[PDB]
Design an enzyme around this catalytic site. Structure first.
Site, PDB file in Angstrom:
ATOM      1  N   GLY A  31       0.890  -1.137   0.000  1.00 44.48           N
ATOM      2  CA  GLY A  31       0.000   0.000   0.000  1.00 44.48           C
ATOM      3  C   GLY A  31       0.930   1.188   0.000  1.00 44.48           C
ATOM      4  N   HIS A  47      -7.595  -2.112  -4.595  1.00 44.90           N
ATOM      5  CA  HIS A  47      -7.905  -3.075  -3.520  1.00 44.90           C
ATOM      6  C   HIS A  47      -7.536  -2.513  -2.130  1.00 44.90           C
ATOM      7  CE1 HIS A  47      -7.193  -7.019  -1.301  1.00 44.90           C
ATOM      8  NE2 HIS A  47      -8.450  -7.114  -1.693  1.00 44.90           N
ATOM      9  N   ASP A  48      -6.339  -1.938  -2.011  1.00 45.15           N
ATOM     10  CA  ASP A  48      -5.907  -1.333  -0.742  1.00 45.15           C
ATOM     11  C   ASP A  48      -6.887  -0.221  -0.315  1.00 45.15           C
ATOM     12  OD1 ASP A  48      -2.242  -1.333  -1.195  1.00 45.15           O
ATOM     13  OD2 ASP A  48      -3.638  -3.007  -0.938  1.00 45.15           O
ATOM     14  N   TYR A  51     -10.077  -1.741   0.984  1.00 46.03           N
ATOM     15  CA  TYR A  51      -9.877  -2.194   2.354  1.00 46.03           C
ATOM     16  C   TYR A  51      -9.870  -1.025   3.340  1.00 46.03           C
ATOM     17  CZ  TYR A  51      -8.683  -7.216   1.725  1.00 46.03           C
ATOM     18  OH  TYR A  51      -8.666  -8.579   1.509  1.00 46.03           O
ATOM     19  N   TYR A  67     -15.533 -14.349   5.489  1.00 40.43           N
ATOM     20  CA  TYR A  67     -16.789 -14.021   4.762  1.00 40.43           C
ATOM     21  C   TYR A  67     -17.278 -15.252   4.018  1.00 40.43           C
ATOM     22  CZ  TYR A  67     -13.354 -13.001   1.000  1.00 40.43           C
ATOM     23  OH  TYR A  67     -12.353 -13.082   0.063  1.00 40.43           O
TER      24      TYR A  67
END
Ligand SMILES: CN(C)c1ccc(O)c2c1C[C@H]1C[C@H]3[C@H](N(C)C)C(O)=C(C(N)=O)C(=O)[C@@]3(O)C(O)=C1C2=O
Ligand SMILES: CN(C)c1ccc(O)c2c1C[C@H]1C[C@H]3[C@H](N(C)C)C(O)=C(C(N)=O)C(=O)[C@@]3(O)C(O)=C1C2=O
Ligand SMILES: CN(C)c1ccc(O)c2c1C[C@H]1C[C@H]3[C@H](N(C)C)C(O)=C(C(N)=O)C(=O)[C@@]3(O)C(O)=C1C2=O
Ligand SMILES: [Ca+2]
Ligand SMILES: [Ca+2]
Ligand SMILES: [Ca+2]
Lengths: 119, 119, 119
Positions: A31, A47-48, A51, A67
């Protein structure tokens, strides 16, 4: 959780090892710091960011959060019984897995020197 | 747990990414091997040592252990309802976050070659 | 889980830091890509393969899965009350810890360049 992210990538990118995505560019496995090296790296940055949003939910810890989802014939679905955190994390993972499948993998961007590329 | 450590660092060092501390010197993100590269690295060594003590508590697994704390206006407090492991891990994290805030960050010590520096 | 794997290695290889095995060759700390660099690296490849089998059990997540075992005088035993996943993961860890104790540690294989060695 992390394993489930790995399995999602296996679902949409079955020809690649998880390890190929686990240290790639400035963001895959990471990240912050740097200009994304290529379009795949940009998937990871997205994606980072996804999140980070999920983490605004109290005690929502994406890599630790279990999940419910299904991989069927290369298609990912997040299941309806997921709590708020689970739902958010599952979608982040799903969208990334789909992004990764489309982005070309550049061998020159695996296991790069972060000091050289990502400042 | 790991996320909570990250958030503590965000509390006391809001101007830095977690990633800057996640691979720095011989000890930030690590342990054992080597002479600490600088004072920030020494914070990390102290943190590792603190975790080793916490691990003397049976089934106490610092990066996995959830604890209760609050970040208020840049100040960290570990809450009283923590079990023995949680309490210990929380304090290790708190003291490190405070240490990190005071130690100057040397760009030359990010993502270093462990073979070169840390034997 | 990861901590318990670390502790197993401490049991059979008390003279080495966990960190020495956490980034070694193409497989210790990793998987996929490459020809194992030496016999210790081969232990790690075997361990990765063992975890892949364990993962065939639904919701079996080796690095996250708690199991029951005992280290006594340098000898590891996995306890009988482990569920299917726990039992499998515990045995993978045990066999690896034993493998690691016997394999010579080559300083030249610590923290290697994956692009150079592991394609
Ligand atoms: C720091 N971050 C918030 C967390 C929190 C909890 C975790 O359990 C973890 C992370 C970082 C992530 C990074 C990812 C990254 N990648 C997606 C594979 C990665 O860079 C690696 C790597 N190869 O070093 C991990 O350690 C990693 O696989 C990992 O095991 C993590 C992990 O275990
Ligand atoms: C090995 N150690 C006992 C554990 C146990 C459970 C864990 O869940 C983890 C570790 C190692 C730590 C190291 C830390 C370290 N750092 C504090 C960020 C670090 O070196 C990284 C990194 N950038 O490679 C991690 O993998 C790390 O973030 C991480 O995800 C860990 C992690 O997920
Ligand atoms: C990706 N893999 C499935 C998982 C899943 C859950 C996890 O919690 C973790 C991993 C990867 C493993 C890799 C191992 C590896 N090694 C055995 C120490 C390793 O390469 C490191 C490392 N030094 O970068 C880890 O991040 C690592 O310690 C780690 O913290 C992991 C970890 O936290
Ligand atoms: Ca483009
Ligand atoms: Ca000093
Ligand atoms: Ca041999």
């Amino acid at each position: 959780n992390l394993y489930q992210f790995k399995n999602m990538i296996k679902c949409t990118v079955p020809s690649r090892s998880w390890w190929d995505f686990a240290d790639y560019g400035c963001y895959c496995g990471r990240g912050g710091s740097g200009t994304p090296v290529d379009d795949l790296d940009r998937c990871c940055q997205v994606h980072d960011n996804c999140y980070n949003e999920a983490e605004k939910i109290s005690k929502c810890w994406p890599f630790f959060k279990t999940y419910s989802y299904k991989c069927s014939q290369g298609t990912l679905t997040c299941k309806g019984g997921n709590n708020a955190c689970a739902a958010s994390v599952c979608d982040c993972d799903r969208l990334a897995a789909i992004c990764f499948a489309g982005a070309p993998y550049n061998d020159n961007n695996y296991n790069i020197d972060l000091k050289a590329r990502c400042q």
